[PDB]
RNA sequence: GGAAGAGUUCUCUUUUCUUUUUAACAAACCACACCCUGAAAUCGGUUUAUCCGGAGCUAGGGUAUGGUGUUUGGAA
């Protein structure tokens, strides 16, 4: 509950992509701080986006519920499988 | 409509009826899937029938598949 509102909060002031290839844009440049996946993503998308992400020493995140719940949560009408937050702005996600 | 012949026709009737072809094959060219840039909702594109889109839309540039069509050759 408390990751979540973080998410949140860093939609409106951090900044962001929800995206496929646009995560692994992000994590080939180094910026992207955390990424989050979404549970049903792929087995192969999964492993890749991981091996990048500690490759560009990226902390990752599991987000429990399927990606349709990622983008209820994340509060956009399109389903989202990873997504990555670049910077927290007011939020505080980094840290926690 | 054009042409050819046969009509009909005191007169009317540019009119009545009939015909007017290009094969297999061989050449050059002629539009659905995918790629590249791209990151999108103020939702866009779109079917006769709303389908797809951060599992990457619209847009731009490409790639292939050529159903076909164009020009001939065959062929007068």
Same mark, same amino acid.
């Given at each position: ?17 929800? !995206? ?35 490759? %560009? ?6 987000? %429990? !519920? ?31």
């Amino acid at each position: 509950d408390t990751i979540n509102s973080k998410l949140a909060l860093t939609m409106k002031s951090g900044k962001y992509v929800l !995206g496929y290839k646009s995560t692994l844009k992000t994590l080939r440049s180094g910026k992207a701080k955390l990424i989050l996946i979404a549970a049903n993503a792929p087995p192969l998308r999964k492993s890749e986006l991981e091996y990048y992400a500690m490759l %560009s020493r990226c902390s990752v995140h599991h987000y %429990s !519920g399927n990606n349709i719940d990622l983008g209820t949560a994340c509060g956009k009408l399109f389903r989202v499988g990873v997504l990555a937050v670049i910077d927290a702005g007011d939020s505080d996600i980094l840290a926690a």
